[PDB]
Amino acid sequence: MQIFVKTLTGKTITLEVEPSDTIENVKAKIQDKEGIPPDQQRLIFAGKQLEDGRTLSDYNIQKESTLHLVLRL
Amino acid sequence: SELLCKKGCGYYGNPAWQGFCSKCWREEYHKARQKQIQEDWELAERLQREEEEAFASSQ
Ligand SMILES: [Zn+2]
């Protein structure tokens, strides 16, 4: 399924994922397509920062769900 | 038979769509997404402003 990741600059990143994918795995995908190292990534969904060891399904992230991304400076 | 859409549009509701017809379900889904998207942006902005302050008191 695809999910969307919006940055604070208006940019939208499209990802191919599965519900059982870990947040860490999602961060690696973002690194593949945007070059951003995983440890700089802060992912947000439904009012929460996403923890690396949980799954997309743990947060009810479904098909066409949109997350937000902030970078550590 | 009276299992009409919960939004009173006149069409029949779907038990799988929590009592809504297709259109009303779709409208609710969009509004719910829009709200969480917007709120998640507010949070992200707050997080950015937190990063900017930590970077300032750093280097
Ligand atoms: Zn309806």
Domains in chain B and their CATH numbers? 13-59 (1.20.5.4770)
Within 13 Å, how many C-alpha atoms sit on residue A35's CB side? 0
Task: Tell me the resolution in Å.
Answer: 2.5
Q: CATH 3.10.129.10: does it fit domain A1-73?
A: no
Are A13 and A5 in contact by the 8 Å Cβ rule? The answer is yes
* Structure token digits, residue A53: 């060891």
Among B44, B51, B55, select the one facing A44 at the smallest CB separation: B44
For residue A18, the 8-state DSSP code is -
Are A50 and A67 in contact by the 8 Å Cβ rule? The answer is yes
Distance B37 CA to ligand 1 centre (A): 24
Distance A27 CA to ligand 1 centre (A): 39
Cross-strand bridge partners of residue A12: A6
**Look-up: residue for tokens 């799954």?**
A55
Asked if A67 is an interface residue toward chain B (Cβ–Cβ < 8 A), one would say yes
Are A65 and A5 in contact by the 8 Å Cβ rule? The answer is no
* Structure token digits, residue A35: 């070059």
State the DSSP string of chain A.
-EEEEEETTS-EEEEE--TT-BHHHHHHHHHHHH---GGGEEEEETTEEPPTTSBGGGGT--TT-EEEEEE--
Cross-strand bridge partners of residue A60: none
Write down the domain spans for chain A.
1-73
Q: Give the whole-angstrom CA distance, residue A46 versus residue A39.
A: 21
**How do A2-7 and A66-71 pair as beta strands?**
parallel
